[PDB]
Curated annotation (Swiss-Prot), chains A, B:
Keyword Cytoplasm tagged: yes
Catalytic activity, reaction form: hydrogencarbonate + NH4(+) + ATP = carbamoyl phosphate + ADP + H2O + H(+)
EC class: transferase
Protein name: Carbamate kinase
Highest taxon, organism lineage: Bacteria
Keyword ATP-binding: yes
Lineage, top ranks: Bacteria, Pseudomonadati, Pseudomonadota, Gammaproteobacteria, Pseudomonadales
Organism encoding this protein: Pseudomonas aeruginosa (strain ATCC 15692 / DSM 22644 / CIP 104116 / JCM 14847 / LMG 12228 / 1C / PRS 101 / PAO1)
Job description of the protein: Kinase that plays an important role in arginine catabolism. Catalyzes the phosphorylation of ADP by carbamoyl phosphate. Shows weak activity with acetylphosphate.
E.C. number(s) listed in UniProt: 2.7.2.2
Amino acid sequence: NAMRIVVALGGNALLRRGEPMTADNQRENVRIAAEQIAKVAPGNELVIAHGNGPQVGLLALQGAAYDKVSPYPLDVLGAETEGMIGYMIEQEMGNLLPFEVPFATILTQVEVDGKDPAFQNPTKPIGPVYSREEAERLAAEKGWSITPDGDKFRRVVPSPRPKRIFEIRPVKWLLEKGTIVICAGGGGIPTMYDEAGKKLSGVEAVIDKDLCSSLLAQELVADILIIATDVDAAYVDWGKPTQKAIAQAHPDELERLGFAAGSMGPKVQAAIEFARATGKDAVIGSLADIVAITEGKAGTRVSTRKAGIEYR
Amino acid sequence: NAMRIVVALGGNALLRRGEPMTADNQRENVRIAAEQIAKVAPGNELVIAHGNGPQVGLLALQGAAYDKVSPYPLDVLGAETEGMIGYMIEQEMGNLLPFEVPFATILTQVEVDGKDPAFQNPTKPIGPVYSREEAERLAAEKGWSITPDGDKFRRVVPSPRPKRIFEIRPVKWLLEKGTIVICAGGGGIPTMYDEAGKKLSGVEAVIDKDLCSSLLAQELVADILIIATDVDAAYVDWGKPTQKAIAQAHPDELERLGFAAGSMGPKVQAAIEFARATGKDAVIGSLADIVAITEGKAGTRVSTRKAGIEYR
C-alpha cells in the first residue's frame, strides 16, 4: 500500500547546462519535474530533496561582485537557496495536486563533524574565477583555499559528510498528517558544534545532496530512496555490443564492478549507504520513470535483499 | 496555562539603522532577540514571524548590480530572505533551549488579491537609486513604477493586503507537537491566482509583516499577537507634561485618538484588525518586556474585551 518515499532531485533537474541561472529557466524545469513527481504523491508519504549547485553558485558570484557590503558566508547562501528552490517546487506541485494535499518547505540544518577529512581537502569550486594576483590576495586575507582553474584560480570549499539532520521530528510529524515535505535542499545548511559541543554554528561548506538524502531517508525510516538522475539506469559494458542496463544489484557487486567510482560514483555510494544501513532499497533512475521505479520496473535498484546482479 | 503566541519581530530587531547588512551584524541582533523570546517558550506554543526590509533590499541591490544574468523577481527574493533569516533565528534559539524543543522554519506563501488597490498605488521603495535617465529606461523596458528620491528615483512596488496563508495546516500540526515555528518571514512570499483562479504564481510585491502576522495569528487561532517594536508602548501626550503610556485600549478609542495614523499606524492597524477579528488581544511593546507582556503587565494591549482606554 502506502510507501514513504524520499526523492532526491538532481541539479540538472532544476537547471540544464548551457542556460542562464534565471528564475524563468528554473521554473520551467521545476514544472517538468513536478509533473513527474506528482504521479507518485497519491496515497504515499513524499519527501522531496534537491541540489542547489547553480543557485548557490550564482549567489556567490553576485555577492563577490558587490563590493559595498561584505557578502554572506556559504552556509547562509545555502539557506537562501532552500527558500528559492523550495518555494518553486512547492508552488508548482500545489498547482498540480488537490489543494487538500498539504505542503511544507522546511529549512534543513545538517550537522557535520569538525574532524571530517574534507576540512583538510576542500574540493568544491565556488565563486568567480580569479587571477593569480587576486586569488593570492584573497587566500592571504581570508584564509581561503583555492584550486587552479586553467591559468586562473577558483576558491574551493570542503564537502564534509552529513552526520545528522536537525529537523527530522517536524518532517515526520508532517508526513504523518499527509504533508508533502520539501527539505534537505542543497544537501542542507552545513552546521558544526564548537569543541565543547555546546554551541552550534554555520560552517562554510557544501554537503553532497545524495549523501544527505541517503541520511534523510535513513533518519525518516523511508521505504525507498529515489536518486533522480538524467540517465535511466547504471549500465555495464557501456558503449559496447554487450551493453546492459542494471535492474538490481547488491552493494557488494556494485563495488566489485567499479560503480562506486566514475561519474556516477557519488550517487552509487549514497545508494549503497542507504541500502546497507536500512535493508531497504535505493533506486537510481529517471523522474520520467518514477511510477515504474516505485513498482520495481525501472531504474537501478540498489539493495541488500538479494546478492549478485540482475539486468534488464 | 499554555498559550499560543505569535510574536512579530520588527525589522530593527534584525538590523539597526546605521550598520551594514552583514551576516555578522544580523546574527548579533538575532541572538539578543532569541534570548528574549526564549523566556516565553516553555509551556507555550510559539510562532515567530519577522520582517525582511534590509535583507530583501540588499538582495535587490546585489541582483541589480550584477549584469551577467537577469536577477530574480521580488517574490523569489522574499523566499530567499525567509531562508536566511529563519535559519539564524532557528539556530540561535536552538542554542538556548533544551534540544528536545523541536524547531521548524517554514517557507510561507501568502495569497494576495489581484484587485487590491495597492497594485494601482505602489508605495514600497526597493533597489538602487537611479538617475532620471536610467529610471526612465527601466520604466519603459520593464514597466516598473518609480518614485522621486531627491533629484533621483527609486523603483516602488505594491504592498497589497494579505488574504490567506497557504501553510496554516502544517504550522498548526507542528505547534500541536510542541514545535517552535518560524514562519511568515518578511510578511510572506506574495502570490496571486490568475483570473480563472486555477494557477498560483508569484507577484512582485511585499506584504506588511504586521498585517501578515495579524492574519497568521487569526488563522492559527492564537491566544495573543505580540507586535514587537523598539518602543515599550503607545503613548498619549507624547513629549508633554501629561505624557502617559497606554496600557490597554479598545480599537474604537485608538482610532478616535489618531493612532491608526502616524509612525505607529501600521502596527496599530494590524493590532486592531486582530482584536476585532478574534476577540483576543494584540500587544504592541518591547521584546525586553515579553514576559510581562504575556502577563498583562507591559505593552499597549489592543483588545475589544473592555471599552475605553487604560493608562500606566
